[model samples]
Target: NNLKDAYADYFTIGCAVNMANFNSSQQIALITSNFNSITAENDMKPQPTQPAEGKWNWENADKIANFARAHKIGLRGHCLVWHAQTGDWMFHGDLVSKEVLFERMRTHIHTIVNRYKDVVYAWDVVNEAMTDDAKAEIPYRQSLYYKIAGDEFIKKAFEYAHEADPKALLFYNDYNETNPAKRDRIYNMVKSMKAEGIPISGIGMQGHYNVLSPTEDEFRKALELYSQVVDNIHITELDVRINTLTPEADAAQVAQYDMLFRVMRDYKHVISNVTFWNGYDGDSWLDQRNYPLLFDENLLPKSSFSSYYKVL
Candidate 1:
């Protein structure tokens, strides 16, 4: 069944795609038939797109954008600023000043966002900028960006992206979003950013969940709390990892997927998109052993897909 069609009344169903998935005819058919939106798994990241200052490598990213446009699927930019998969040049050298960093950030955001502004509807303006440790004195992750310009880097990122494409939504994407302490910190950061007029529009909870963690209550609480401060939410990278592949494991995975979709449906007002990290389990970054996605190695729907598709 077409997941996008199944959820047409609710939100968009999306999947992450890499070059391999894009080139495979079978995978292409699966994606075009089921998902209504797409995110580049890695090609669109800062390093790949522009590894050096003023250098542009839009070949792979452009292909994904072209594919999305051709298929009439929405494109969500994976990220404009991130701690990982970013070029060391952005944080290289001992004397990198805040002004220098912000300028570089501005240039990167403007260049990428402006290129596919029409194709991309939303951009992960800054990703994983918050520390997982809730007890930390500061909520921000002490990445090079944070060390150089503190939280100002986040504010500038959204502002620059908005300047590049005023129509696009800007999001702060992160994992571990349902951890109580981490969730509160995320809430506070977004709330404060909004109060300060940061042009932030949403939160992208990288749903790299497992069947056993972040029980239903934790998940629901995070959604409710985040919806209070932002009007848009995207399950940017969803994959329910499991320790082993067995009948019981599959059943539990399906149950987890079912619960997530039910909660997402109840909060459809704020949750605008739900994207699987990969189209199928084999391609998942968590590797084949985890069986983290809704489709199997051969691109057939698993129990999780069958169960969640009936969430409506």
Candidate 2:
């Protein structure tokens, strides 16, 4: 069986899509061949979707949704709200009021969610909302949304998305969940929301890793911990970097990815999806820092490709 079909009983295998590769047949072919799901890398972000104050751009996002529907693949909306990539307009004006900012956010969430309600299977309702301030028990990142509406911003976003698309799954996506303090804060937030009856259905642990950082024990612990916190756990936006391109480094990277897949497979009940940050290393956001995907530049499968199938 092929990768997607073989793993059908388990979670959906997903990959990120870049607008630049939309016209590239090679990239599209590579994606449709292996991945069963898609995440628009930047097209669905705040900057591109609704760049200006009130103006909305839907070209690439619509293209991505159309492609996913055409292929019969699941589409996970990259994000409806985030602290970064929102552009200056979001942070503009002299202290935007809660009512004004809330209105804009509500409009944005409802508009995007309803537009793609039938097309998308899930959405990252909020991304990276927790702060890095380890000392604070509840360090919510002072993102523009938080700065204006405070913690209620997250709650409101989730509510609006759920109201817009009751069938679509909602998630909180963030990176570095492997760090104990960070993981604790995230778990507490999820627990609090669950208790409040929020429509947040999943926690997207952005598995952005390197060859050395966060030991294997920490990675496994994070997965295990989040599995119980939310109904669904998605390994969203995964990329394991290799600083050195030697055989040993290459082999280690494959092992790292295989381990994650193995863990996901083990907890298939909780983990519903696994999306690599990009389809191929060439398509990676970390291209300059490291080649961090199963496929090399030419859209050819690397040794990790075999390693991935081996685990399943």
Candidate 3:
């Protein structure tokens, strides 16, 4: 009768979770990985509020913020910056000056943080700032932020976010966090920020593991090392994928879930939030072509879902 009301436990506005769906009590905080669906929002953009700034569409953002507030959900701004999936005019402006770019960066941060200042729990200030091959600080001349405002853009972005709402935490989010070389680069960057008094609070591990890349051991090491320094760490977007959703592949994916979930629970002391990339297969980006979800379109829990629940 209520197939639409799935999970009905263990989640928040996204779906029902183990916690009371309507609990107003402040127990364990909830977290979500946002996709910033501008096409889905309302009253945010469309000329009057932020002209020449694409659609300041807050409709989708509203559903997000309102749902969080109505349900006392904790929000983690999935990303404030991305080279992809942003307004076109952000790059080609009146002067296209480094000056203008910095202003745009600050404006975007201020708009979001200020609006959700008290409500949001964390902000992914920068996403994928480093390339898989980006070496040295000045590398990646093509990075929009770097190309526009130079390297100072990074420091400025985080700093401006703090100014917007000091209470909201900031994070540096990226993929392939299990890569030692890449991890070291981030460690060095964040360490420098620490020295310079940057308000970086945690790391956003976009855990998108294919069949290969990171062994569970490597993933654990990444979490262990991050916990040592960061006040809190999160498995921000956890999705274990394989070539197909066959029984065998599904079985392997389930193991990945078990391994990662155990790590999160074991390191729960340092870890604050663990969010599955998406709640169900229907809305999952990997859906249609991707079978990376715990529930099927019927909203029924898969065998892997039960196994994952056992681990949790």
By descending TM-score, how would the candidates be arranged? 1, 2, 3
- The segments of candidate 3 whose C-alpha lies over 4 angstroms from its true place after superposition are 1-51, 93-95, 134-141, 211-213
lDDT of each: 0.91, 0.84, 0.62
Cα TM-score of candidate 3? 0.79
Give lDDT for model 1: 0.91
Return the TM-score for each candidate structure.
0.98, 0.95, 0.79
Error of 2 at 231 (Å): 0.8
lDDT of 2 at 253: 84
Which has the better lDDT: candidate 1, or candidate 3?
Answer: 1
Q: Which stretches of candidate 2 lie above 4 Å from their native place?
A: 133-138
lDDT of 3 at 23: 29
| Candidate 1, pairs of clashing residues | none
On a 0 to 100 scale, what is the lDDT of residue 96 in model 2?
75
- Candidate with more favorable, higher TM-score: 1 or 3: 1
Which ten contiguous residues of candidate 3 have the minimum total lDDT?
34-43
Tens-digit lDDT string for candidate 2 (1-312): 446876888988899887866668888777778889999999999888888866999999999998888888899998888988885676554867888777888888888887887779999999999977455345798767787887898898899898898888899998888999889889888989889988889999898888676577888788788877788988898888986367888888887777767777888888889898887877788864597888898888888888888752
lDDT of 3 by residue, 1-312 (tens): 121122223222222222121222321122232211111112222222344564465545566567666645566666676665556577683537877877887888788777776567777777777667544444332576667776577788789888898887788878878898777767777777767988888887877766454777888888877776678776676666665257777777677766766666677676655555654565565655566766665546666666655532
